[PDB]
Amino acid sequence: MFKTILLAYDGSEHARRAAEVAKAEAEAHGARLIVVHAYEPVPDYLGEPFFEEALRRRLERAEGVLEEARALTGVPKEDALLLEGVPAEAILQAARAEKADLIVMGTRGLGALGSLFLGSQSQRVVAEAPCPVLLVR
Amino acid sequence: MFKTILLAYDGSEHARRAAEVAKAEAEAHGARLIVVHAYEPVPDYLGEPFFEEALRRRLERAEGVLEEARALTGVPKEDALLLEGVPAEAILQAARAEKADLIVMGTRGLGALGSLFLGSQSQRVVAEAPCPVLLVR
């Protein structure tokens, strides 16, 4: 059987630190490490040609952030997932689908709303995760 | 150098599950596991002989809960600590003093006030911990 560590990464300093923690946990447990970056879609009230230009830049940056996480953790490309949607929901859906044993994530980052206690996306994952959550500042 | 995993234990089902997680983390990392149980003191407005009888029962139960955690994790007696005071503050003071690398704790338990999102003591530890926190339901 194998254990799976899921890292939520958004390019924030919190997430870089979470990446170092998740790499060490996967190595210590002999577990598979899956890295996920989730991005919200460009809003569709933008008109031509702005929508299309924003769609291209948004995806290119999202892929640049996920490539960074793959470079910091060393996981194969198939294990670095790019999900479009509400971040916490993407993370929780990946954790369920991958039968994750632990989700490692920064205390803050991942979305636009949060407090100095937790970002709104980390708080939703802590409330609904199907496995233990390792929070990293 | 050595890594230290600190387990907060209160005898709740959350804490029993956290104990299984903390035992596996210490084994996987080759880390020292310190188990802490914190209890609040008997209130001193109780009169004689009630105060003294409550003092004796409270300490005996606190030691029974900590012995349970030592039996579930296998740590030596010197590594199972019994602290009297506000739970989260005892936990955070132990984590600082023991240079903890991770605190593993249930999402709920440890005190008298909490919500269905987190107990008030887990929330304070998440807000102030000197290291990453691994929350376990």
Side-chain angles (χ1 to χ4, degrees):
Chain A
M1 51 188 3
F2 42 21
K3 271 178 152 68
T4 293
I5 301 316
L6 189 165
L7 166 72
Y9 186 90
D10 69 357
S12 68
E13 292 285 14
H14 308 112
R16 297 182 64 86
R17 288 186 287 271
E20 287 308 305
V21 165
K23 182 180 188 305
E25 290 293 335
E27 290 172 345
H29 285 101
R32 171 175 62 148
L33 177 55
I34 295 310
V35 177
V36 172
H37 174 49
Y39 67 96
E40 322 219 35
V42 171
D44 60 14
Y45 55 74
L46 292 179
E48 282 55 57
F50 309 105
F51 174 80
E52 293 75 12
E53 296 178 348
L55 179 159
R56 278 183 282 284
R57 287 181 313 255
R58 170 83 55 97
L59 176 66
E60 209 167 59
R61 299 295 78 76
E63 289 171 335
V65 164
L66 182 61
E67 285 278 10
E68 186 176 74
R70 183 189 61 115
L72 290 168
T73 55
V75 301
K77 290 175 165 192
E78 58 274 20
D79 287 345
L81 307 186
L82 182 64
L83 309 180
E84 186 175 41
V86 172
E89 291 311 320
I91 291 298
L92 290 166
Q93 288 174 33
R96 287 192 298 256
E98 298 294 345
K99 302 282 261 273
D101 295 284
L102 179 67
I103 288 169
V104 178
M105 69 185 315
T107 49
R108 293 142 39 164
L110 306 173
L113 313 186
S115 71
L116 284 176
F117 172 54
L118 285 180
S120 68
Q121 303 306 293
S122 299
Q123 177 153 329
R124 172 70 171 178
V125 169
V126 168
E128 301 300 327
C131 61
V133 176
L134 193 171
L135 291 174
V136 179
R137 192 188 17 255
Chain B
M1 51 188 3
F2 42 21
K3 271 178 152 68
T4 293
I5 301 316
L6 189 165
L7 166 72
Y9 186 90
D10 69 357
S12 68
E13 292 285 14
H14 308 112
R16 297 182 64 86
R17 288 186 287 271
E20 287 308 305
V21 165
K23 182 180 188 305
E25 290 293 335
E27 290 172 345
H29 285 101
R32 171 175 62 148
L33 177 55
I34 295 310
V35 177
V36 172
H37 174 49
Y39 67 96
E40 322 219 35
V42 171
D44 60 14
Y45 55 74
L46 292 179
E48 282 55 57
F50 309 105
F51 174 80
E52 293 75 12
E53 296 178 348
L55 179 159
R56 278 183 282 284
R57 287 181 313 255
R58 170 83 55 97
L59 176 66
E60 209 167 59
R61 299 295 78 76
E63 289 171 335
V65 164
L66 182 61
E67 285 278 10
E68 186 176 74
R70 183 189 61 115
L72 290 168
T73 55
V75 301
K77 290 175 165 192
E78 58 274 20
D79 287 345
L81 307 186
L82 182 64
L83 309 180
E84 186 175 41
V86 172
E89 291 311 320
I91 291 298
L92 290 166
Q93 288 174 33
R96 287 192 298 256
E98 298 294 345
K99 302 282 261 273
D101 295 284
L102 179 67
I103 288 169
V104 178
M105 69 185 315
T107 49
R108 293 142 39 164
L110 306 173
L113 313 186
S115 71
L116 284 176
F117 172 54
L118 285 180
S120 68
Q121 303 306 293
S122 299
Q123 177 153 329
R124 172 70 171 178
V125 169
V126 168
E128 301 300 327
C131 61
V133 176
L134 193 171
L135 291 174
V136 179
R137 192 188 17 255

